[PDB]
Structures are given as C-alpha cells and as structure tokens.
Amino acid sequence: SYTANLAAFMIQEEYVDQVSGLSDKKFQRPNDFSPPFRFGTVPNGSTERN
Amino acid sequence: EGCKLVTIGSGKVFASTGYGIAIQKDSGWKRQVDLAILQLFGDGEMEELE
Amino acid sequence: MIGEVVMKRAYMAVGSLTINEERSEVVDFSVPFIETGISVMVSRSNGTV
Amino acid sequence: MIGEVVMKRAYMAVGSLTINEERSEVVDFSVPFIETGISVMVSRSNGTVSPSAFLEPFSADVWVMMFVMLLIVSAVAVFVFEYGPSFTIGKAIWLLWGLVFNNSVPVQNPKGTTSKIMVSVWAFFAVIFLASYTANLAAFMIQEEYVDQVSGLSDKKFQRPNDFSPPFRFGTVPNGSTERNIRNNYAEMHAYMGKFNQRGVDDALLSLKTGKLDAFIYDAAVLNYMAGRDEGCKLVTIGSGKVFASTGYGIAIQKDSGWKRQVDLAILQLFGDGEMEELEALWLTGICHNEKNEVMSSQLDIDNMAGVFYMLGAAMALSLITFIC
Amino acid sequence: IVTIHQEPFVYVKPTLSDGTCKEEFTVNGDPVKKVICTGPNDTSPGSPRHTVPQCCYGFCIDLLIKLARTMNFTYEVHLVADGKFGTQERVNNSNKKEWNGMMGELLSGQADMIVAPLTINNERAQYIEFSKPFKYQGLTILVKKEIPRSTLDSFMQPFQSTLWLLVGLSVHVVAVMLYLLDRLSSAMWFSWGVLLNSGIGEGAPRSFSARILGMVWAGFAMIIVASYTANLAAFLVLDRPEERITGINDPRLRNPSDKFIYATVKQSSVDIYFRRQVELSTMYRHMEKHNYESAAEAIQAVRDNKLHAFIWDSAVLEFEASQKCDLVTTGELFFRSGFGIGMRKDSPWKQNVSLSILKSHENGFMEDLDKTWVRYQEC
Amino acid sequence: TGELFFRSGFGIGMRKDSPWKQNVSLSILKSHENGFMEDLDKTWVRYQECDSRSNAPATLTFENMAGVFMLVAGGIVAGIFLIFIEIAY
Ligand SMILES: O=C(O)[C@H]1CN(CCCP(=O)(O)O)CCN1
Ligand SMILES: O=C(O)[C@H]1CN(CCCP(=O)(O)O)CCN1
Ligand SMILES: *[C@@H]1O[C@H](CO)[C@@H](O)[C@H](O)[C@H]1NC(C)=O
C-alpha cells in the first residue's frame, strides 16, 4: 500500500509564480531577495513614461 | 513556440485601458456606433472573433 | 490616424488605437471593443519538488 | 405528406421523409440532406487484462538472456570458490534463484570473500530487475474500453447465431419498413428474429440495458439520435461506414416542377459552405458523441490470472515427470 | 446618489448608539473613509419598512469621495428600496413596461447619479449614459471545492474472494505435494514462509524432485505479490475526484437536469444576457425557477451544499473565493464588460466624470484602491 | 483519424438532356433496395486482415535496460582480478 500510494503521489504538474504585478516585493524591493531580478521593458514609449 | 511563456491574469493589470474608434469631436454617429459595439457584446460575436 | 482625424481628412480611425486622458480633447472615442494595459510575461517553471 | 403533395393540396413537404424505389413515381425528391438506413445498436463493453499480461513487461530475449547470465554467474562463482558442505554448483544456482525472486526461500551463503562481491552485485541486479518489473506491470494495468462492433448484417453472428455461444438475440420493431426489408432480403434472419419482437423504441433501450436483448436493428438516424442522448453513454451504434440499404431524407416536390433544380442547387451549396455540419452540431449531436473509451481499471479475477496458474500446473507436472524418471 | 449592497465594493454596517460609524483603521494605519447612507433594513421592508440610517463605506465610497473632491459638489448617499440592480418588465396593469431598481430610481428622478458595480449593456444604454469603465471584468462561475478523499475499500479489494480462496488452496496443495515427494509440517511451514516472506522454518528439500517445485512456488509468490502491488497502484492513480464545470460550454450546463442546480440573481445583467441568447433557451428556462434575490444569499446557499454553481461577476467572485478557502472560480471569463457611472442624458457631468476616471486610471489611484479593497488572495 | 466532414456521395455523371437520368436513378435505387449494393460492398470492399485497438504500453527491450548486464559484467571482470590478487597475497 505504501509503495502504491507513493507511486500515485509521484505525479506532478506545472505551477505559475502568480505575481501580483508591479505591486509585490519582487518589483518594489528586488534587493530583499536576489537583487538581480532582470526585468525590463522597451524604452522610448508610453510604458516607460508611465 | 513550445508554449513555454505565460502572462499574468487580466485582473492583475496596471493602468487598464482599451482600444476604441476615433470619431469627430461633434457627431451623432458616435451615439449610434457605441450602441452597435454594445450589441456585439450581447449576441456574443466578440467571443467568436477573439 | 489621430492627425488625419483632426485634419478633417477622415471621419473615423479603425485599428489598434489606445484611449488615454490626452488625445481625448481633439477626438471622441467609442466604447472599447478590447481591453489592454500594462502586463508582465514570464516563462514557466517545472515545480516538481 | 405524400398524399397531400399528390392531391395538390401542397407544393412541397419538409420533414423526415425517406426516399425509396416506390413513392418516387408520384413525387420528385431532391438531393438528400441526411443519410439513413438499417443499422444495429448494441451495448458497450469494458474488457479485462490478458492472461499473459504477467509476461508483457519483459521480452523473451530478456528472460532467456537473464537465465544464461545467471548460469554464467553461478559457474564463475563456483570456480572462484574452488580456489563439511562448503559449497556446491547445485547450491549456488538455488541461492541465486532465491535472491532474484525477492530472496524469500532459505539459502546457504558462500565461504569466500571473493564470492561475496559477486553475490552483492547479483543482489543489486535482482533488486533493480524486480523494481523494473513491478513498475512495468503497474503501467500495463491501465486498460481502456473496447467497442465489440460487428460488420453488420453480414457476419456469422447474425446469419448463424445457433452455432456459437448463446444467440445474440438481435431484435427489431415489427410491422415496419425495416421488417419488410429484412424479410425480402434474408428470410432466415427474419424468421429467427420473430422471438425478439419489441413494442416501441423506448422500451427497446430498457431491454438492451437490462440484458434481455443484445442488439436492436432500426433506422440509422433514429438510433444515432437516441444513442447521442444516452444516460451514461453505455449504448453505441455500429457506425456510418457499415449500413444496410442506405438512403437519405429528402424534400418531396411536385412532379415536373421548376423549383427542383433550384432546391437541389441550394442544398448542395449549403453542403459545400459547411452549414450542415454546424446544424448537426447543435440539432443532432447528443450529450456524448466525441468521447473515447474510459479506462476504469477493474480488479483481477480467475480468468485474468489464468496464465500464472497454468504455468504453475505445468511446472508441477514437469516435477512429477522428473520424479517418475 | 443611489447605491446597492455589494460586499467587495459597498460594505454596509449598523451605526453606533450615538449615530456615528465606529472608528476604524487600515493595516497601514490610516482611517477608513465612511459616509452616512440612509436606507431600509437588510431584509425586505414589508410591515417594518422604517428607513433606519446605516452608514456605508468601501471602494465605491472612496471613488465617490475622490470624484466629489475633484469637482466641487456635495453628495447624499442612500440605498435602493427593492434591492435590485435594474431590469425591464411588465406589470399586472396596462402593458406599459417600466424599469425597476437603481435604473428605475434614476429614470424617475429620485436619484441624480449611480455609484455601484453596474455593468454596461445595450439594454440600459439606450436610456441612461455611462462613463468610461472604472473596472474591467467579466462573468465567471463559482463552485465549492470537494475534499480529496480516498474511496478505497478493505485491503481485499484488488483480489476477489475466489482468488484468495484459490491461493489458499494452492499453497496447501504445493506443501502436501512437496511433503509426499520427499519420501509434514515442515513443508507447510516452508510454503507459508515463501509465500508471506516471513523467514520462518529451515526446510531443506534436498530431493531433486522438490527443488524445481520450490523454485516454481517462489516465482509464483513473487508474481502474485507484484501483480497485487501493480493493481493497487493503478487503482490509486485512477482514483480522482470528478472534474469541475471548466467553462460555460460544459455539456452538463448545456443540458439542464435536476441532478445539477445552477442559478443567478434575479433582475440583473446576467438574467438579461441569458434571456437574450437564442441558443441558451434551456439554460434560461432551468434557471428561471432557481434564481436568488441577492448575491450574498446565493453565496451562502452554494456554500452550504445547496447550490452547485453560481454565475456572477468575476470581480466579486474572485474576492469571495480568496477569503473563504472552500470556494473556487471555475471556467474562463465570458461576456467581458466594465463597471461605469450611470447618469441621466443631457447632464453637465458626463465629460468631467469620464475625464476624471481616465486620469485616475492613468495616475495610479485606481490601482491603490484595488490593492486596499481587493487582492487578498490567501487560499 | 478524426470524424468524417463534408458528407457526400458518389454518383453517375451525365450530360444535360440525356435520356438516361431517370432510368439510371431508378436502377440505383432498386440496387440499393434489393441488396445488390450490399453484396458488391461485401465482395470488393470488405477486409479485416489487420485490425487495430488501444495499443498496449511499450515493453522494456534489451537495449532499453542493457545497463544492468554491463554493470554485472564489469563487476565480474573486477572480481576475477580481485580474487587473483587475494590468492597471490
Ligand atoms: O499608443 C497607441 O496608439 C498604440 C501603440 N501601442 C504600443 C505601445 C508601445 P510602449 O509601451 O509605449 O513602448 C500599442 C497600441 N496602442
Ligand atoms: O419514411 C418514413 O416514413 C419515416 C419512417 N421511418 C420509420 C421506419 C419504421 P420501419 O423501419 O418500417 O419499421 C423513420 C423515418 N422515415
Ligand atoms: C427508360 O425506361 C423506360 C421504361 O421505364 C423505357 O421505356 C425507355 O426506353 C428507357 N430509356 C432508354 C433510353 O432506354
């Protein structure tokens, strides 16, 4: 029974980080965690100005 | 290619806006045009187009 | 397209036109048929630990 | 409808009207917009595991190869040990065989340091082999359903049902076009079907579900419509490719009418555009039509484990024969 | 201003003895703006239709305060009488269809503006004027998640009783045959130890006619154990809970049956949308006999194993499902729309209100509001 | 693979104003009714030489698990030298 249940539990799927978006600590305080978050955009546009 | 990318949900969007149709500053056509667009949202044609 | 509409050379501009506080003092927009904004795109993670 | 059209009280008839050799000399039919005929509906099955499935994980090359490898390892271990009952060639084989099969039976350990390494390596190989066999057997246990379909009014199950397992007991509603066609085409089948007459179509499904009937012969369109809306998707038709006396539903028009060509052209245009598929998607398709066979793995019975018992009996007989000799 | 009761957007609470809202502060340590809105009790007026004031607050109240500050004008918030959003229906009197709820109140002149989660649709867009959407959302379905239980019977499930009896007979048969071929309890002990892998006994079948039988018995026991383990693993893997609706196009929703019950709020935008559809007549007919009079009541009914699915706005269902831990929103958003401010035609506020909404969206005021009153995902 | 789409049928083509359309159609209908078409189908297009069903899971072949044998062979080749050195010392 233990082996069968362990084999059943071995099936795994993918997950999404589920970031709030421009309002979580990942973007506001990148230095708290690994500072090099490496997130950017395209300059000279409405998004950069906003 | 490979479906390795993903985007956050529509709920977590900053500075939400939309795509519209530009019309003259003073014109009655707009008063009808808007209604027409709303009609497309009732019959469900927007979902099929998307 | 905004300039063409303003210059009286056209009556409507159909396309991927964004609505904003500015650009609304010269033309009148209709009800948006599609929503947009600022979004973040990221890759996927296996997450099998 | 045919009388109304012939009597001039109407110009066209729209509905589920069939086309046949008769009924055409008095009315002109257009191109059919839906197929039909004489089909057979039977209950679905599930299926079990094959008796030999216990040998599926490994190919024969594997078993014989492992046998020869075990023999070679035993011989090498005996030779190494050669350099009271210290060890024997016949005991090393027994020890290795016990080790391979989960190491349950008692064995006698060797009396040599060199042989201990070989024993450990063999034990590691045996554990890996057992794990692989168990994993493969677990994977093989995923069994899907199978549709035990028939050719349709052309196989021995319908022509000669008395020369096999209990008869299929195929039945159809009497006093109809299907019964007349069966009588005119196959007299023997019509005579044999007289013991399974069904009153109505609604009770035919209940009879098939309970087990009193095994096959219902009727119009293809009605059978497909009924099967689509089954409460459990336990009933499946035979298929559109195998239908007897195929025909179609048409529109009755007045003889020598000028609208026939236009009507046929419009129907063909509708077929070409793709409107027929859309219409059938919402008007004819049932709850479950585009569905595969559910796995629904079941337990094991005597039939499932027949191979292992047969092998055990054969081994016992071989042992008895060797003892007699 | 006429407002309705919506938990995510409009919180309504009783006032204190002195007639003032109790002081409250947010997590960041700032006061929560509150206003006094005069409306009836939570239940229907009926006999005790007294309109006891009950001050209200929320995201909509903050938006109204911001709008009032931006353009100089005073407000007087009050709740609706019938407690509905608004729809067009006939009356028992002569056939003169009229609006009801907030839409009817606005049309009749009892109110000058509407500040609440009012969807924008063509039906009510021909009589009043809507501003730019201050919140884009859609329509979603909320259900109750089922606990992941295991429907496993006793350990005897993989093997039927007949197989167990046959194995028991076989072990004894092999033991007796081995004992006879030797020329006993030793054979039985050896067979039991081999089968159960217990390591009991010292049976030594030296006879050449018994070693083959012992090896065959060991192989048979190993095969039986492996088959049992594989069958148990396969059964456990294929034991999963029934799939959810997963969208509105689920065949179960298409065909309505007494087994599954789903409804919505009476006289709302969802009802109009479902009635206007031509291909959803069956769903509308089924839901006509199960619709609820409020969103909170429907949420409670679905929570207490009474309603199977609740169709409502995504903005509200997501918030509700993020603080309950037992409700989940299933499917993809359909009938995308937005929330706007309704006003009477030819009013000197439409352009300014729309410009203020656009400015708030661009600057970031709206975002803040969503963070303060929404985005509480903890499940 | 898939489900049939664009359902149609095979027919006999003729030029317009040809005195064979009605008779040909009647003959086709009679053949359908009397089972001649069924006999033709069973005579020409009727074969089940190799059927198909849900394929069973793949089986482990020699090349799929040829590592354990190599490992045991290496173990034995090392053990021969080990025993030789042990006997020599
Ligand atoms: O503004 C518009 O009219 C168009 C242009 N947009 C491109 C925005 C590019 P960026 O984010 O500013 O760098 C796409 C649709 N709206
Ligand atoms: O052509 C028609 O009139 C209808 C009637 N059909 C019923 C046939 C009854 P049976 O096969 O003779 O027992 C169904 C559709 N066609
Ligand atoms: C067609 O059949 C009719 C009898 O139904 C016959 O008189 C006629 O000659 C046939 N036509 C031809 C071209 O043979």
Alpha-carbon gap: B14 to the closest alpha carbon of chain E (Å): 7
Q: Residue E247 in contact with residue E140, Cβ under 8 Å?
A: no
Longest dimension (CA), chain E: 115
Alpha-carbon gap: F14 to the closest alpha carbon of chain D (Å): 15
Beta bridge partners of D295: none
SS (H, E, C) chain D: CHHHHHCCCCCEEEEEEECCCCCCCCCEECCCCEEEEEEEEEECCCCCCCHHHHHCCECHHHHHHHHHHHHHHHHHHHHHHHCCCCCCHHHHHHHHHHHHCCCCCCCCCCCCHHHHHHHHHHHHHHHHHHHHHHHHHHHHCCCCCCCCCCCCCCCHHHHCHHHCCCCCCCEECCCCHHHHHHHHHCHHHHHHHHHHCCCCCHHHHHHHHHCCCCCEEEEHHHHHHHHHCCCCCCEEECCCCCCEEEEEEEEEECCCCCHHHHHHHHHHHHHHHCHHHHHHHHHCCCCCCCCCCCCCCCCECCCCCHHHHHHHHHHHHHHHHHHHC
D30 vs D24: CA distance, rounded Å: 11
Q: Does E227 touch chain D (CB under 8 A)?
A: yes
- Find chain D residues with C-beta within 8 A of E230's C-beta: 134, 137-138, 140-141
Residue E286 has, within 13 A of its CA and on its CB side, a CA count of 16
* CA E280 / ligand 2 centre spacing (Å): 31
> Chain C 17-46, CB below 8 Å of chain E: which residues?
19-21, 24, 31-32, 35
Residue E325, classed as helix, strand or coil, is: coil
DSSP F53: -
Distances D170 to D177, D212, D216, E195, F25 between C-alpha atoms, Å:
17, 10, 6, 49, 33
Chains C and F: 3 or more CB pairs within 8 Å of each other:
no
Q: At what angle do helices E59-70 and E350-363 cross, to 10 degrees?
A: 110
> Chain E 117-176, CB below 8 Å of chain A: which residues?
155
Which H or E run includes B7? strand B5-7
E261 vs E141: CA distance, rounded Å: 13
**Contacts within 8 Å (CB) and 24+ apart, E160-165:** E160/D299, E160/D300, E160/D301, E162/D301, E162/D302, E163/D300, E163/D301, E163/D302, E163/D305
Write the residue in D117, D146, D276 that is nearest to F79 by C-beta: D117
E296 vs E280: CA distance, rounded Å: 25
Question: What's at B3, amino acid-wise?
Answer: C
Q: Which residues contact E96 (CB under 8 A, 6 or more apart)?
A: none
Comparing alpha-carbon positions, the chain E residue that sits nearest to A4 is: E233
Residues flanking ligand 1, CB < 6 Å? A 42, 45-47; C 16-18
B42 vs C8: CA distance, rounded Å: 33
Residue among F58, C14, A2, E202 nearest D140 (CA):
F58
**Contacts within 8 Å (CB) and 24+ apart, D277-282:** D277/F5, D277/F6, D282/E279
Q: Which residues contact E286 (CB under 8 A, 6 or more apart)?
A: E256, E262
* CA D177 / ligand 2 centre spacing (Å): 6
φ, ψ for residue E140, nearest 5 deg: -140, 170
E34 vs F82: CA distance, rounded Å: 88
E37 vs E77: CA distance, rounded Å: 5
Question: What's at E86, amino acid-wise?
Answer: G
Q: Which residues contact E292 (CB under 8 A, 6 or more apart)?
A: E263, E264, E265, E266, E298, E301, E307
Q: Does E273 touch chain B (CB under 8 A)?
A: yes
Q: Which residues contact D28 (CB under 8 A, 6 or more apart)?
A: D252, D253, D254, D255, D256, D257, D260
| Length of chain F in terms of residues written | 89
Comparing alpha-carbon positions, the chain E residue that sits nearest to A6 is: E233
E176 vs E350: CA distance, rounded Å: 99
- Find chain E residues with C-beta within 8 A of D308's C-beta: 220, 223-224, 227
Exposure of B49 by Cβ count < 10 A (0-12 exposed, 13-18 middle, 19+ buried)? exposed
DSSP E7: T
Question: Beta-carbon neighbour count of residue E115 at 10 Å?
Answer: 23
E299 vs E310: CA distance, rounded Å: 7
Question: Beta-carbon neighbour count of residue E280 at 10 Å?
Answer: 18
Q: Residue E353 in contact with residue E131, Cβ under 8 Å?
A: yes
Write the residue in E125, E277, E315 that is nearest to B38 by C-beta: E125
Q: Which residue has the tokens 């005897």?
A: E156
Tell me, using a 6 A CB cutoff, whether residue D179 lines ligand 2.
Answer: yes
Q: Residue E21 in contact with residue E15, Cβ under 8 Å?
A: yes
Q: Which residues contact E44 (CB under 8 A, 6 or more apart)?
A: E83
B contact chains, 3+ CB pairs < 8 A: A, C, E
Write the residue in E121, E133, E315 that is nearest to B42 by C-beta: E121
D182 vs D190: CA distance, rounded Å: 6
Alpha-carbon gap: B44 to the closest alpha carbon of chain C (Å): 12
Tell whether residue E48 is among the known ligand binding residues: no
Residue F43 has, within 13 A of its CA and on its CB side, a CA count of 6
Q: Residue E207 in contact with residue E182, Cβ under 8 Å?
A: yes
Question: Beta-carbon neighbour count of residue A26 at 10 Å?
Answer: 17
Question: What's at C2, amino acid-wise?
Answer: I
What determination technique applies here? cryo-EM
Q: Which residue has the tokens 């190869």?
A: D65
E130 vs E32: CA distance, rounded Å: 28
φ, ψ for residue D303, nearest 5 deg: -65, -40
Residue E207, classed as helix, strand or coil, is: coil
Counting ligand 1 atoms within 8 A of each CB, the residue from A46, A48, A50 with the most, and so the one to mutate, is A46
CA B20 to chain centre: 7
Q: Residue E12 in contact with residue E34, Cβ under 8 Å?
A: no
Alpha-carbon gap: C47 to the closest alpha carbon of chain A (Å): 6
Question: Beta-carbon neighbour count of residue B29 at 10 Å?
Answer: 15
Which H or E run includes F80? helix F67-88
E83 vs E100: CA distance, rounded Å: 10
DSSP A30: T
Question: What tokens were used for D212?
Answer: 């009193």
A17 vs E315: CA distance, rounded Å: 21
Which H or E run includes E3? strand E2-3
Residue E289, classed as helix, strand or coil, is: coil
Exposure of D9 by Cβ count < 10 A (0-12 exposed, 13-18 middle, 19+ buried)? exposed
D21 vs E213: CA distance, rounded Å: 73
E320 vs E327: CA distance, rounded Å: 8
Q: Residue D174 in contact with residue D197, Cβ under 8 Å?
A: yes
CA E108 to chain centre: 36
E32 vs E229: CA distance, rounded Å: 61
Find which of E152, E159, E161, E215 to mutate to test the D interface (most D CBs within 10 Å of its CB).
Answer: E215
Q: Residue B11 in contact with residue C40, Cβ under 8 Å?
A: no
Question: What tokens were used for D154?
Answer: 């052309």
Write the residue in C2, C11, C31 that is nearest to B37 by C-beta: C31
E300 vs E317: CA distance, rounded Å: 13
Residues flanking ligand 3, CB < 6 Å? F 19-20, 23
Q: Residue E291 in contact with residue E208, Cβ under 8 Å?
A: no
Q: Residue D302 in contact with residue E166, Cβ under 8 Å?
A: yes
Q: Which residue has the tokens 């993989």?
A: E158
φ, ψ for residue D119, nearest 5 deg: -65, -45
Atom index in ligand 3 nearest the CA of residue F20 equals 13
Q: Residue E134 in contact with residue E148, Cβ under 8 Å?
A: no
Q: Which residues contact D293 (CB under 8 A, 6 or more apart)?
A: D144, D145, D146, D147, F54
Q: Residue B22 in contact with residue E109, Cβ under 8 Å?
A: no
Question: What tokens were used for D73?
Answer: 């390892």
Residue among D106, D95, D96 nearest D70 (CA):
D96
- Find chain C residues with C-beta within 8 A of E120's C-beta: 31
Taking an 8 Å cut-off on Cβ atoms, the answer to whether E229 and A11 are in contact is no
Write the residue in C21, C31, C32 that is nearest to E355 by C-beta: C21
Question: Beta-carbon neighbour count of residue D275 at 10 Å?
Answer: 11
Q: Residue B26 in contact with residue C26, Cβ under 8 Å?
A: no
> Chain A 10-39, CB below 8 Å of chain C: which residues?
12-17, 19, 21-22, 39
CA E301 to chain centre: 11
Tell whether residue E205 is among the known ligand binding residues: no
Residue A1, classed as helix, strand or coil, is: coil
Q: Residue D97 in contact with residue F66, Cβ under 8 Å?
A: no
Q: Residue D90 in contact with residue D113, Cβ under 8 Å?
A: no
C32 vs C46: CA distance, rounded Å: 37
Atom index in ligand 1 nearest the CA of residue A43 equals 13
Pairing label, strands E78-79, E2-3 = parallel
The torsion defined by the Cα of D114, D116, D118 and D120, in degrees rounded to 10, comes to -150
Residue E106 has, within 13 A of its CA and on its CB side, a CA count of 29
Q: What is the DSSP string of E153-168?
A: --TTSSB-HHHHHHHH
Taking an 8 Å cut-off on Cβ atoms, the answer to whether A20 and B12 are in contact is yes
**Protein residue whose Cα sits closest to atom 10 of ligand 1:** A45
Q: Does A10 touch chain E (CB under 8 A)?
A: no
Tell me, using a 6 A CB cutoff, whether residue D20 lines ligand 2.
Answer: no
Residue C34, classed as helix, strand or coil, is: strand
Taking an 8 Å cut-off on Cβ atoms, the answer to whether C31 and E336 are in contact is no
Question: What tokens were used for B15?
Answer: 């500075």
- Find chain C residues with C-beta within 8 A of E136's C-beta: 35
- Interrupted after residues, chain E (C–N over 2.5 Å): 183
* CA F19 / ligand 3 centre spacing (Å): 8
Which H or E run includes E141? strand E135-144
D189 vs D178: CA distance, rounded Å: 12
DSSP E274: H
Distances D209 to D157, D204, D230, E340 between C-alpha atoms, Å:
20, 9, 11, 56
Tell me, using a 6 A CB cutoff, whether residue D178 lines ligand 2.
Answer: yes
Residue F20, classed as helix, strand or coil, is: coil
Which H or E run includes B33? helix B29-43
Write the residue in E133, E336, E359 that is nearest to C21 by C-beta: E359
Phi-psi region of D136 (alpha: psi -120 to 50; beta: other; left: phi over 0): alpha
